[PDB]
Design a protein around this ligand. Sequence first.
Ligand code: HEA
Ligand SMILES: CCCCC/C=C\C/C=C/C/C=C\C/C=C\CCCC(=O)O[C@H](COC(=O)CCCCCCCCCCCCCCCCC)COP(=O)(O)OCCN
Ligand SMILES: CCCCC/C=C/C/C=C/CCCCCCCC(=O)O[C@H](COC(=O)CCCCCCCCCCCCCCC)COP(=O)(O)OCC[N+](C)(C)C
Ligand SMILES: CCCCCC/C=C/CCCCCCCCCC(=O)O[C@H](COC(=O)CCCCCCCCCCCCCCC)COP(=O)(O)OC[C@@H](O)CO
Ligand SMILES: CCCCCCCCCCO[C@@H]1O[C@H](CO)[C@@H](O[C@H]2O[C@H](CO)[C@@H](O)[C@H](O)[C@H]2O)[C@H](O)[C@H]1O
Ligand code: CUA
Ligand SMILES: [O-][O-]
Ligand SMILES: [Cu+2]
Ligand SMILES: [Mg+2]
Ligand code: NA
Ligand code: NA
Ligand SMILES: [Zn+2]
Lengths: 43, 73, 98, 58, 144, 514, 105, 49, 259, 84, 46, 79, 227
Amino acid sequence: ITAKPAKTPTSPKEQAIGLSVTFLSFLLPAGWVLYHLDNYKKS
Amino acid sequence: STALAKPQMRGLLARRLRFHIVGAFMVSLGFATFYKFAVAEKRKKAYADFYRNYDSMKDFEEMRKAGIFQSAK
Amino acid sequence: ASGGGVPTDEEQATGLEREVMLAARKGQDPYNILAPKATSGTKEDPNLVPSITNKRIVGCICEEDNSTVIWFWLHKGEAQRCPSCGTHYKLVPHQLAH
Amino acid sequence: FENRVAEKQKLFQEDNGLPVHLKGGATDNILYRVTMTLCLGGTLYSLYCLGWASFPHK
Amino acid sequence: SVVKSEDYALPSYVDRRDYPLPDVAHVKNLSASQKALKEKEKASWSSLSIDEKVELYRLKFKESFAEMNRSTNEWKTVVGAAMFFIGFTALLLIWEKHYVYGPIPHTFEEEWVAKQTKRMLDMKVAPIQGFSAKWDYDKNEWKK
Amino acid sequence: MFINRWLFSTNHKDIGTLYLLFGAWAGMVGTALSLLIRAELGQPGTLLGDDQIYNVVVTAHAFVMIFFMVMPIMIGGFGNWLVPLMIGAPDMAFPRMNNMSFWLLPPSFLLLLASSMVEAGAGTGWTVYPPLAGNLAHAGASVDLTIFSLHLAGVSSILGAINFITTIINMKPPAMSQYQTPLFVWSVMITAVLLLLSLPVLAAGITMLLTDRNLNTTFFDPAGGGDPILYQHLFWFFGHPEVYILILPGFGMISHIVTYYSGKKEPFGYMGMVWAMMSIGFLGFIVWAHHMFTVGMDVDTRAYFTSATMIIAIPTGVKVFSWLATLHGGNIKWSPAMMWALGFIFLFTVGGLTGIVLANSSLDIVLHDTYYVVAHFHYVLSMGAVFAIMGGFVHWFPLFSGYTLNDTWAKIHFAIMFVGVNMTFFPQHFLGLSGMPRRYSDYPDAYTMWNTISSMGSFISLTAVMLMVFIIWEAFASKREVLTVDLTTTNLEWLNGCPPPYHTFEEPTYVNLK
Amino acid sequence: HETDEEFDARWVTYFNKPDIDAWELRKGMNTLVGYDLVPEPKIIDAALRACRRLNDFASAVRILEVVKDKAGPHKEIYPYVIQELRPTLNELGISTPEELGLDKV
Amino acid sequence: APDFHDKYGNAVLASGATFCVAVWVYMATQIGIEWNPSPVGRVTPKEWR
Amino acid sequence: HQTHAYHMVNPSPWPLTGALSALLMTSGLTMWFHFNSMTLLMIGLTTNMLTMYQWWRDVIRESTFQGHHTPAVQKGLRYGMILFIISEVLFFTGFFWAFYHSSLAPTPELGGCWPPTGIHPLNPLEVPLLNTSVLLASGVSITWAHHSLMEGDRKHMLQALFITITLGVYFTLLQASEYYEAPFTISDGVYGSTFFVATGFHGLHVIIGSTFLIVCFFRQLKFHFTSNHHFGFEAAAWYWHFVDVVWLFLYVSIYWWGS
Amino acid sequence: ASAAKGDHGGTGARTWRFLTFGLALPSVALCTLNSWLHSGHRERPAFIPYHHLRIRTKPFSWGDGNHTFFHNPRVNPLPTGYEK
Amino acid sequence: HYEEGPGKNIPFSVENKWRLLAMMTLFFGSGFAAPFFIVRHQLLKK
Amino acid sequence: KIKNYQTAPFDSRFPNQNQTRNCWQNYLDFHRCEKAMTAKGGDVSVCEWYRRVYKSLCPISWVSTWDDRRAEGTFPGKI
Amino acid sequence: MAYPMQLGFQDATSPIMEELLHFHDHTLMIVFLISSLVLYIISLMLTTKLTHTSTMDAQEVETIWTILPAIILILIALPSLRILYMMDEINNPSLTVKTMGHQWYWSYEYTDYEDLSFDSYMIPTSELKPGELRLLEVDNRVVLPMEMTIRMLVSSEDVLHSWAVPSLGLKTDAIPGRLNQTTLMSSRPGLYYGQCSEICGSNHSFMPIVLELVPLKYFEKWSASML
Ligand code: HEA
Ligand SMILES: CCCCC/C=C\C/C=C/C/C=C\C/C=C\CCCC(=O)O[C@H](COC(=O)CCCCCCCCCCCCCCCCC)COP(=O)(O)OCCN
Ligand SMILES: CCCCC/C=C/C/C=C/CCCCCCCC(=O)O[C@H](COC(=O)CCCCCCCCCCCCCCC)COP(=O)(O)OCC[N+](C)(C)C
Ligand SMILES: CCCCCC/C=C/CCCCCCCCCC(=O)O[C@H](COC(=O)CCCCCCCCCCCCCCC)COP(=O)(O)OC[C@@H](O)CO
Ligand SMILES: CCCCCCCCCCO[C@@H]1O[C@H](CO)[C@@H](O[C@H]2O[C@H](CO)[C@@H](O)[C@H](O)[C@H]2O)[C@H](O)[C@H]1O
Ligand code: CUA
Ligand SMILES: [O-][O-]
Ligand SMILES: [Cu+2]
Ligand SMILES: [Mg+2]
Ligand code: NA
Ligand code: NA
Ligand SMILES: [Zn+2]
């Protein structure tokens, strides 16, 4: 396939930001829950 | 210098296919021979050799003396 | 035993249903219900492809019972050829439904 | 009864840009509004009932 | 030169080694001198210079076969980045073992395991091949 | 306008888009449940609780992955987007009923979430066998909310099947016979027949479970003369066709991908592929009791279900070899989508072969309700249905959106996922053969090493799933607009540009009869 | 079905048609390279002379490139074909891709 | 012109490889995971009764 | 402007309201079963009827009043209805499988026999035979209705269709009386379970089919059907023959052979 | 079979009306005769608390939880016997 | 009519990539987070 | 009168994995035989074989429930 | 029992389980060979620049790749079904033992002669004696005579369970209202473990099975002592 160059290029820095935000959005709430499992169980 | 000889120019892909499928077939027979000797027959002989002179009462008495049983001390 | 009182399609069909009905009576197929029959497809005798715009997708079944259909846009102008079998197609643009 | 289909065909073919479910007139809009209000209202209430049934009542 | 979105229904250029002669020329608009070059192409090609021949090729085609078939270093990026994210995953596993997992049962303590091993051997667990078969009941040691 | 367009749609592309968004969200839900499973099992002992919370998680994992992720993506998503384009149709036969098929799924998913929030959830297995699932051992609303969740998903798919069958039979160009429609179109139609015939039987069985639970019927209760094994027959009468429903659209997408990235105009042996998909669909209805080899059935019955299950390898093998023959002589393009399809061919073949091991009732005595089964079905679902989804998504993402993915990121994504799924599931064969049961929150100590590796694998798949979200974001963020696509003469769905207009084929294609 | 000799003759005849047009030239070469063979010199010779009648130098060079490509790893075929075409290449003024530097990546 | 892979390929490969090995070896040996390997050839059996 | 014959439907709210009505009915049943309350359920049943009413109203507007049902569109509706009926056959098939499974292998709790100890089946020669003659007769009258419509005879269409509907109502009233008079109940083991669930879903389908016939009756009164274009009537007739054939299978299997 | 009628000159409204009034409805009228004739109540059987009958694993969601939906006092005993 | 073309045939905006990132994060993040919070809800009952 | 009973032998009427009807039939046969003998002025010892078989095969809780129901008047089998 | 890092089946304790081992070896060789062949052919198709993209005739090769799989299937089904019917054969048991599944433990009934029955519960991890196996030991083992044919009868008094002993090749579902039959014959004395093999609620993972195989005289005295 052929395509145009990006209309709004995403530089390496922007990509590191989108990658970091994306991972944190999965990792932090589940991490919070698993971290506090004991509190939930032996509540 | 000298002219180059005319090489084979037709059916090159089909020729490669034929040659490697026969090679796959001869490897497949070689592996089945290995497998039948390293796994299947090995297992048949381990079981046969184990039970050939197996003494189940002697086996039991060893277990009994080691203390493993609820019903037999 | 048998009076009337039920309308017919001729009396009461409307909209596109009626347009299809009336065109069929004239032997016409403006809404593409039938498969067109091929010509010989030469440059002199090309398959004539009606359209209401200046391009139409053709699918070419190059040989009878091919499962593969060859698709391409046919444009207003000089006849074009199927990229697989070469048979000729020519667009004939027109006016208000086919 | 008389056959009045032609009048309904004129009404529903009128070039007023209305979608078919509103093309009969203001009574369509009322019926639409009653239906969607009951559906959306009832859905919020089902969420309230889920939230209630999600916790023990000793 | 410039390909537009609004051109999708028109015959288009492609460099594909299995489609050597595409449906259109790479360059359709010609300068004054490129026009003169196309006229000279109608006479003997022996009178074309090397540069004129390369230019005629570059009007018709975008990339040559050697160019379009070239290999790349992309595999290095792919394999290295994959190993990075696999390495990242171990950080998640480190975190999980530190903050989520508690102690494992006492049956994995070294002395428990040694006694369980003796007991498994006393009951002759898998004596034909799998476990006790690998113990030498005469020399009181694991078989070599 | 926004409400008109996205809540009131009668457009096959927009509805297809709704299904892809819904399935993607469900896939996040199913992934989290899969990680909770493997966190529980990743070290010996108890992490979350006893088997009740654990099997609520297992049950939801299965329902979400099957009914809210694979089926909506393959059938609702790819089927709605591609089927009308691939036959030159202006939309589906029933464009407004099509929209209700979609809008029944968020309610269905809400009922499943509700079931896990009330009481102690439905800790039943996705098979929902009684008496565990009846009103004494699972008192309260959770199991009934599960049953109603299934009823809505079942209505959604039955109406969808009717819509797909009618569209594919009735809305091709008049010159196009059924034997000139692409293989993906065939795979959807055959999938739709299977849905039509199988889901009403599921619906009858779960309805009988509902009435045993709430109206004092005793279909499955021996005190009234009923039979727990009757439920198992009715469920698997649906449940075996359901796994062919889960793979057939995948087979069709694989045929198209392998043909495309081999640079071929057509798959090898088209009529053989049609024959094979129909044969699989038919044999898929006469083999259900191979899910019941340990229930106490007569030996002749076991012998029949053994042999009829094994014969399905023959048409399936024709498809695998025909894919290999499509590669043969191709101008191979090593695109990310081609990697998914190649992984599919090999890893679906492995899981199909362990299915054949399991078809032998004698051996299945020992393998049944062990992780050997879990390994089999994740080779064909995590490395089969899912690989065809990922291959299809990367290949057609530019058609649906008008934008290109970054191919290097997509290859990185493939490599990570490939390592993670094999690390996850390959060791489960050993756990199976050595006796580890299904649906255990904890295991005897000896099983520790393979469970530890298997859970580490599941974390690698997690990293791939997260990376996938970033890759989709990078595509929409950079806005690289498609220009030219190769091979449009044999891939009609690309011929209206990227993305195609809202209305396509307003003027139908021209195809003559000759 | 037909002999190798009948195949080649059908293809030599195809390209020798005096008034072959540009579409027919492209269709012939694009179809030909689908086959499991590298085309005989006498076929390429006829295609090159069709290029000449069509005043298309560039497609002549491209046809030589595709001969090389169709040979795959068999590095001996292309220099043999070029050897055999040299009198035609000289008579027509057709430079090879290598003589034009178009074999450089 | 040299693309991203010409410029940074060697370094991504080398660094990804080295980081991946180091962190998995660390996770596998240094944080108390119980692999539960075979006792064969490793454990001295001890009286239990 | 299109130049194919298929129907592009205006964007509609009823898929959404039908789907929410399904949520409200199923969560309503849950609340009724487990939280002693009928409110959600009645809301769902109301929105469900509203949805059906407006949706099929619109289909009539689109066809009779707007003319979108070309022959190609009609052919599609034909397939759709056939496929819908096939799905309903397979639904009943699961209940017949349950019935045969339990009655062909009666368990010790039943006395090891069928009919179970303590069950006194209805006499299949009394009201069940009457029900059979009724539905069979309605199959004959609906066919007379069909032929009258094709021959353009408005009065005899209406008369035959009215006779058909009266018979459907008769069946329903007879069945409701038999339910009340039956000495066994749905809680009487697997006999009562299979009996009332299978005949109960059949009776629901009789009520749906009768409603569909009544819709055709009022549409006929308003001259909607032509002598050649009347697919709603054909669909209602196909559905009516399906309800008839299911009865015959129930009669032979459960009332007669299972007695 | 051929039943034992005949006709088949063609298929028409008139023939199906003939069948409706000359065969179908007279059949209904005859079975209506047969049924409402063998009508009348029959002696309800002795009550035996069989454990496979009068099942109650959960209260019914109406009434007092112990009555079936179309409970008939004359012929439907409760788990504890007939109503009084 | 409706808007046609890249970025316009979808129920969410891609006009600003950072707002897109936030929308996609909430969308996929809420799906992934939900089972952890349901597990927590169930443990916090009993 | 043929004893050295060890356990219930293979019975060709019940050759399959599901043995429920084997237990049930021998339970009925024993209690039918006992009723015949108790009445007609005979001795239940002729019923012994059925009693051995059903005791061997039948779960304790099945016998105990069936016994309770015969006592109550609610046993659905014919004896 | 299973041992750490185990790859395959537990060693066979009965002739039938020994048959299954050899049949699995036979089937696994075919699985390896077909899997390997597919992997190899894939790699072959992908490793040449030679092309051939015109239409390919199929019907010739489709004979091969329908016939050879059919033969392979017959070569599996033949030993498969021989074992199936061999397992079904009449045997004349010396002893009948019943097991009833419960939430969450097994009871056993030996009622050929006396009314002997008892409950069998997992040993809790806090009460294991050193050397004992976590989640697998029970308080009251299922003592049985070795080298003898035993009829096991399996049912349940609540939900489904399934009664399994991998090294004897045994798995029989425990269904309420149903009495399922299997046969058991151990070639050796010793201790043989299994686990509940149908999901059955909160303690599904924790209701194991332990058979204790001993000579007939020990079994008889144990039985008398359990009255
Ligand atoms: C997409 C899903 C999918 C697919 C496609 C399949 C495909 C098959 N499955 Fe599987 N299966 C499941 C999903 C799937 N399965 C699930 C979810 C379960 C468990 C359900 C539960 O309990 O929850 C399961 C359970 C299951 C069981 C029950 C085991 C048990 O519970 O004890 C069995 C038994 O026969 C079985 C067999 C098969 C077979 C023979 C195929 C065949 O279709 C495979 C055919 C393919 C090949 C054989 C490979 C290609 C062929 C060749 C290359 C030709 C040459 C090959 C030979 C000559 C053999 N499956
Ligand atoms: C007049 C002739 C026809 C009568 C119809 C009366 C109402 C029935 C409506 C039809 C529904 C059919 C099946 C529902 C299940 C049971 C109803 C069986 C028919 C019936 O009405 O059975 C009655 C019991 O009703 C009961 O329990 C109460 C039942 C009320 C609640 C119904 C429960 C919910 C239904 C679930 C629907 C799921 C639908 C399928 C979705 C599939 C998606 C693919 C029998 O009365 P009885 O007093 O026990 O004995 C008579 C003694 N003199
Ligand atoms: C479980 C165990 C299963 C094991 C399965 C093992 C599979 C073994 C497969 C072996 C395949 C052998 C196939 C032989 C087919 C021969 C067809 C033929 O004979 O070739 C042609 C027909 O072509 C055509 O359909 C197109 C040519 C190819 C047609 C057949 C291609 C099949 C390719 C398969 C590739 C391997 C994929 C499957 C591997 C399992 C005719 O060619 P010509 O030279 O005349 O034309 C060239 C023109 N000239 C020469 C005149 C210049
Ligand atoms: C106690 C009850 C509780 C549950 C509620 C059930 C309520 C009953 C609803 C009964 C069904 C009524 C259906 C009315 C349909 C009217 C619309 C219609 O019939 O529309 C026709 C098209 O057919 C079409 O869509 C036909 C589409 C109709 C399919 C309907 C089939 C029945 C489905 C009902 C749901 C069953 C659920 C069963 C439980 C599992 C219009 O085309 P024509 O007739 O050719 O006219 C055109 C001519 O005028 C031109 O000259
Ligand atoms: C299966 C999917 C999950 C894979 C593993 C996830 C990787 C974890 C990501 C980090 O998650 C965070 O971890 C912190 C710990 O590192 C937690 O802070 C907790 O710990 C901190 C340090 O003890 C305290 O400062 C905080 O207040 C306390 O919330 C925090 O809540 C949680 O969001
Ligand atoms: Cu008992 Cu699982
Ligand atoms: O189901 O395989
Ligand atoms: Cu199956
Ligand atoms: Mg099981
Ligand atoms: Na655990
Ligand atoms: Na009609
Ligand atoms: Zn063509």
